[PDB]
Amino acid sequence: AHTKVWQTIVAEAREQAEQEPMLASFYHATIIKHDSLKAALSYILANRLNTASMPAMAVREVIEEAFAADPSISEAAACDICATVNRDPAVSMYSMPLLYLKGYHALQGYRVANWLWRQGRKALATYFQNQISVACQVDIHPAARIGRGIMLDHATGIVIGETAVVEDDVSILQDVTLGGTGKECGDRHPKIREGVMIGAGAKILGNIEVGEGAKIGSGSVVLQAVPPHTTVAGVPARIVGRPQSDKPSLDMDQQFNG
Amino acid sequence: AHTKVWQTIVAEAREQAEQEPMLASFYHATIIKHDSLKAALSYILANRLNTASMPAMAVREVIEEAFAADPSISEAAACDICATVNRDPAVSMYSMPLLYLKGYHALQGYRVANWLWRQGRKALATYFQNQISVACQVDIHPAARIGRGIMLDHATGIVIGETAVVEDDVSILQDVTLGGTGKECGDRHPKIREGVMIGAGAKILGNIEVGEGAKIGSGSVVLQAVPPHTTVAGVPARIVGRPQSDKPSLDMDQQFNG
Amino acid sequence: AHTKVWQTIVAEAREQAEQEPMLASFYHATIIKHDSLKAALSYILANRLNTASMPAMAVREVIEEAFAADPSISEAAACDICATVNRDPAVSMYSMPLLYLKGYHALQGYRVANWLWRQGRKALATYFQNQISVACQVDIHPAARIGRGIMLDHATGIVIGETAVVEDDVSILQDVTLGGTGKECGDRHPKIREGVMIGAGAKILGNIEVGEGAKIGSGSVVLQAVPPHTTVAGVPARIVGRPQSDKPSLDMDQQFNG
Amino acid sequence: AHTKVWQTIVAEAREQAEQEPMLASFYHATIIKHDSLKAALSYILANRLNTASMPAMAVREVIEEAFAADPSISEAAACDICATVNRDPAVSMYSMPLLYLKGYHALQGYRVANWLWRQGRKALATYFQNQISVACQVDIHPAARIGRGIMLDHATGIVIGETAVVEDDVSILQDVTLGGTGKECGDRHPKIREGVMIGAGAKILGNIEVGEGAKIGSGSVVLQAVPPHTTVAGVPARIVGRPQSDKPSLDMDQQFNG
Amino acid sequence: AHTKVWQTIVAEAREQAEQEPMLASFYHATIIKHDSLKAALSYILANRLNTASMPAMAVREVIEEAFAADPSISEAAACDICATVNRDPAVSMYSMPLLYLKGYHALQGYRVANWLWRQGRKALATYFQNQISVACQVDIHPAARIGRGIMLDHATGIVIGETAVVEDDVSILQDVTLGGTGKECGDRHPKIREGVMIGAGAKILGNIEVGEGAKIGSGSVVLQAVPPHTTVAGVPARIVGRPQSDKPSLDMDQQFNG
Amino acid sequence: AHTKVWQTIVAEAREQAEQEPMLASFYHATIIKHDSLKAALSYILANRLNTASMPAMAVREVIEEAFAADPSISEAAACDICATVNRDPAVSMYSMPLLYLKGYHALQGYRVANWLWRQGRKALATYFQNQISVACQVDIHPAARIGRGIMLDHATGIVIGETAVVEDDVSILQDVTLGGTGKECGDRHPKIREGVMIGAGAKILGNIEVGEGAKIGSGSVVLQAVPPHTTVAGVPARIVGRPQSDKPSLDMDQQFNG
Ligand SMILES: NC(=[NH2+])NCCC[C@H](N)C(=O)O
Ligand SMILES: NC(=[NH2+])NCCC[C@H](N)C(=O)O
Ligand SMILES: NC(=[NH2+])NCCC[C@H](N)C(=O)O
Ligand SMILES: NC(=[NH2+])NCCC[C@H](N)C(=O)O
Ligand SMILES: NC(=[NH2+])NCCC[C@H](N)C(=O)O
Ligand SMILES: NC(=[NH2+])NCCC[C@H](N)C(=O)O
Ligand code: NA
Ligand code: NA
């Protein structure tokens, strides 16, 4: 996929460039000049991560070093594109998440902060985490554990704490909290299993599990484990049914009768 | 109202300039030196939309182009000022929405992006949409249809999706979603009719009508059509009462069970 | 506390400067160069409040004037750091709130805006409030009355309106609104007494008392006075339980009924 | 010439845009999207004049105001383009002076500052003068009187003082001074008449005439009036020959002893 | 003087502020808000010294530290203002060199680099020296020794090397070199004694003395000691007469018959 | 030389990072992070060439493409560093030209512009040339032919035109012009052969030979071929003597007759 995904992005960019002379250079410098998603993504992220104390051009090298050391980062990033193209009716182009969508930017920003975290460069990981919170309005602790094929749609107000886990193929909307409880260190954030769909505004708190292919109703406050393949809703949330599909993250059906 | 509004804005600006030497030049350059709201607003929005790849000065031209081609836009903008002064007790000056309020900026930004969208300049429309999301923390699809006399108070976390309709004289607080459902293209976002008030944090999802003068309680999750002149609250929302005025957007009474 | 807090911040700063060469100069310029919290905080705050019309270097002088004229401001700033270290398991360094946390930045920003407001410098206070709202995604009316030992964790989407009161030792999470009701001037915003804990996404509206040591459940919509030492939750919120500690803000137990 | 010049500039810009994808947006935003030289030039000069205290976008309005009030300014500007294309073998394109050459920018900058000066806006005139000195390394007093068909080639170190006069059709190379003498106010700068060429590094000092079609050799120091149609060279300069054309500014023959 | 000079600057600034609304805030933030030349000068210099790697706000502290450690720096800076007001017919206001003139900026920038040099902070002094060369087009080695009452008029292209000395009351115009000879370390730059006037373009090379109250002809190349109270001119320079006055720096008479 | 030069630069950099905490990160980001001159030089050059229309991060990719495509460019850059250390008594560190010296920046910038020009990318080469002229105050036509071991000391005002040739081991000071004559295309700029030294402010014009090992006196105006191993000086320049060394550029003896 990752190779075909890149070629399509370049094809789309050539077309957009021709269509919009105000953005022709933007499309060229970010995408068309480049050979790989890595080069395009590092540019775009460095611009979002830009601060007075560490300009974009300096930031880009850090991003490039993470991408070179861990090939899985760029590849997750390509899987995250497909996920959003597939699940979001408002996105029908592969170049869109890469260029435009702050939830996508914050997610790949996270991957870089996480790599830093894992190298022991914790100050710099904290610095990136909090710049992303300011610039993308998404707050993901660098020690969170996040899989691939993830869609963060709209994303304003997403909060993902330190010991949170998000497995492959999860879809999360604006204003979702995967939050902690208490003042003590240790496991205290939710574990979101594969295929889970989380509607706008949901709050999930404590070290609790959300089982495979569960659906979390929009506006839910979840304080206890959610069984696999159930739909929950309410404040606090209770089981209200069973999702129409095996992996409700892929289908994005917001209804809660099930 | 249009020129009374402009003349009041200029008079307030002169007074504020005299009072705050740190901001005299800001008041002069945005307001006092200008003949219309168009020139003031193009300047202020240009600064909000500013990015590395397209600086304010180049952005201003695109804003001015939309204003010159569609006169209703700046008409709507003046109308939105009066909306905010009338409805929001924390705002007693006509220059305040214009100068300061990110909800106001996001909304006028949408008008320009919508104009772009309507000319087939969709990449630039998308560019502006997402820059506004980043800068004003309000995400409105440029294809959404929004009337006039709209107040977006505080505004952080507002999402309004592709096929949404918002009629004249609506009030919408922070963290409100007018959201979609499913992965399929097609009509899938709410239709908010005239006079509706939407309390903070409400989520409304799917292609459902919210009838004229309905009141959506704070924190509500709305999945079904709301009868006109009805008050809904809860997760998921149900009818809890009926508003006394025909247009609760005008009065901003946040109490429900009434 | 004052001196011990600053000396600890300097020691951490020296330690971090040695671990991270990309940030050695950042740590030196903000912290290690300085002999008080005021110098460090004015610098960091100036950068966050930076706008085209009033650049950091200029803003910084305004912040310092406030710090010199009202010594209670830096003291409160010191107290809030301790509050965050003690209460947030993800923060174990005193220099972290100062340097990184937008909720912290926003709160100390409010303190400068409030001082300006108390001087009659209202245009500038409003300028500040709304820049903080855009840059930190926290919107606090400069006329709000806020005590000390306050933690705003994560903070995206926090709204605190004109007549709101927040006493000492309160903890408030992302997406919380202390909001108003109606279109008229007058007292209309919540009074949050000492010891209160407000979970993510809670909406409290109108001139209502939230009693000493109450806990407000995540996602709650509060329309009526909350008795002291009570836990409320729901949409609309009802009594679901009672906290065990006198000041649930100190413990951050998100559980309810609880 | 005026609209042939503009139309040629637009045609060249379209070709350059096609050739250089890195600069397509630059060519479009400065030239291709515009109807006149005025709009192109106001954009380009605004960027050159940009400073912390007055950004390009605000500067553009002042430039456009001068252009609207005094039509001769943009007339002069087009005439200066043709001067540079005709006289300078390294320049074969009409868009080149407009886009690239700091001598050209400094000169059109002076026209705007001179307009300001003539309206009594002397602080802003002085602000622009000195910003041009810093940005273009050309220092022209706004009260100087400069005609049209002027070429400032390379331009670094050009100084032209308060009471200087430069007539139409003059050519002036880098490091040329039209300088004053004494500490007293009053007429004390050269009068350079029509057709004069001034070679690199020439210094001309005091209220002295340089007669029509005189040629000032490179490196000359001129302290006395120069007869029309005369060639001077040396430190201090003396007559060394006579030019064959009536207007050596047109031919740029740098040889002397002839 | 230094006290009266400051009060006049504030009086002038209040007047300019009232005259030019585009610059009212600029005048307020730089001058009117302030109590001393130090505060105004550090602001203005920090803006000129601003680079990506060390923003203005960071630079200002370094400047302020030099001013606090060595009171003679601010006081020389006030004497340099008077010198230029007195000697330059184009400057009749005390606020002008401070705000506008790059030769003045470069000179006071030098004083700060020199203080750094003397403290052993040689990297930072070199960094400031070369930023001033880029931003003001004046290259003064931090180890140069420069007195007070100095006017650098127009200044483009001034070069003052490592072992150069400039005593009190010297006036230097654009494109003057006080330059070195050879490839060996040690004394190799000129010693400009008190009262000396140096015309535009002069080149003075080698460890040679220019005696009190000498006049250096514009465009002179000086390779041997110049006797006190003589006028030299030519390439290479010879004695052509005697200055009309005791201190030709004060009178600025460019004539060279004497 | 290559490897030894880079290793020395890194060692100095480490040393300077420890002496100056304000610059530790600057030294790390430009030098210590990197394993070749190319990475360090591309970064520093990008920042100098930074413009609104093409920011540093984007420019950097263009510089690197040139460095990769033509290995002779970095080699020449290495050689020029050595030339400056050896010849300028005020430079004893190999990292100084790289980091600080605009003449060095401008020359290496020329090398990128020249490469672009040789690819047919002439708009971009012209864009670069003129940005260098504004930012470094050196104006070198991209079609000029320049060798290696070149020192441009101080550099303000240097002009080198289209058909100029500069062979290896040439030293050129501030305010030197290698300039053209006439309005026609064709060979018209000087040929400066190996070993030549050009003193401050010298003007050499027309398609004339400056022979191997010549010395050009400061302030000279050269209109005719200079024999090899000759010293010329004056306006216009005549033979005044003969250099003792074969390559006066290596020794920098400014004396004439000499
Ligand atoms: N130099 C600066 N202004 N840095 C501001 C950003 C610091 C830190 N990355 C944050 O999240 O806020
Ligand atoms: N190349 C750039 N970073 N340009 C400005 C930022 C783009 C902006 N964040 C967007 O959403 O489109
Ligand atoms: N011209 C500007 N710099 N405007 C900045 C944004 C306006 C104002 N600072 C605000 O509250 O949002
Ligand atoms: N406050 C500022 N620095 N504004 C922009 C720079 C001013 C500019 N250098 C001048 O000569 O006037
Ligand atoms: N980070 C930067 N871009 N620094 C550029 C300036 C460096 C050094 N002060 C100089 O004179 O050039
Ligand atoms: N729009 C811009 N960024 N222009 C920058 C100046 C133009 C061009 N870089 C030059 O050679 O001077
Ligand atoms: Na899609
Ligand atoms: Na004067």
From TrEMBL, chains A, B, C, D, E, F:
Origin superkingdom: Bacteria
Enzyme superclass (EC): transferase
Keyword terms, alphabetized: Acyltransferase, Amino-acid biosynthesis, Cysteine biosynthesis, Cytoplasm, Repeat, Transferase
Locations listed in the record: Cytoplasm
One Pfam family of this chain: SATase_N
EC number from the UniProt entry: 2.3.1.30
Pathway: Amino-acid biosynthesis; L-cysteine biosynthesis; L-cysteine from L-serine: step 1/2
GO MF annotation: an example: serine O-acetyltransferase activity
SMART domains from the UniProt entry: SATase_N
Similarity comment text for this entry: Belongs to the transferase hexapeptide repeat family.
PANTHER family in the record: SERINE ACETYLTRANSFERASE
The protein, known as: Serine acetyltransferase
